[PDB]
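Case study: Variable lymphocyte receptor C.
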Amino acid sequence: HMACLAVGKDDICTCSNKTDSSPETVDCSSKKLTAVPTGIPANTEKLQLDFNQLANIPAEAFHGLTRLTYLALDYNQLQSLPVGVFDQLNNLNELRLQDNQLTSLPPGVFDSLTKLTYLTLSQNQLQSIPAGVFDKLTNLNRLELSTNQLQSVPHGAFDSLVNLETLHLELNPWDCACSDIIYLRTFIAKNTDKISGMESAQCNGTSTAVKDVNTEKIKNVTC
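Here is what the predicted structure looks like once written out:
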């Protein structure tokens, strides 16, 4: 068995042609899948692999899905993402990766996604974020990093996000005892007026708000 028998014919997943209320959809959600099925039609616009039991994504799983605008991989058991897994996905608008077990991301993993508007990485266990990982996402409106293991963010990580409207940073063990936090502290203070949801970023996860931190003491303490 595969994902679809045709564009509008189900197999494992529910497969719909594009309609006036929905894009061309392959719905594999809630199927307890342990593997990404083959047979995902080339013109698929919306791929829902959320709420399954995927532990690995094949590196070439999404190659050729040029029309993909929506990709849901949230609520699985992903420990990592393959290098280049989202390359070629030029038309992607939404990428849902929340509620996995991601500890890290490959550099340049989002680079092809120049039309991405919504990115969720919340409820994982990201220990760090690679430098420049968001630099290509100039059309991003909403980014969710809440509930992870981030102690800091690389200098200038959000600077290319000129169209950002919403950024969630809460429930992260932010390290406000060293100089690396100053960039984050500064970004929140400067952009709380144009980007929402940032003020919940707290030192050590649940302590003093990063935004209100006294930086004079730690400005010279190297992390």
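For the exam, be able to explain this: Residues 1-223 form one domain.
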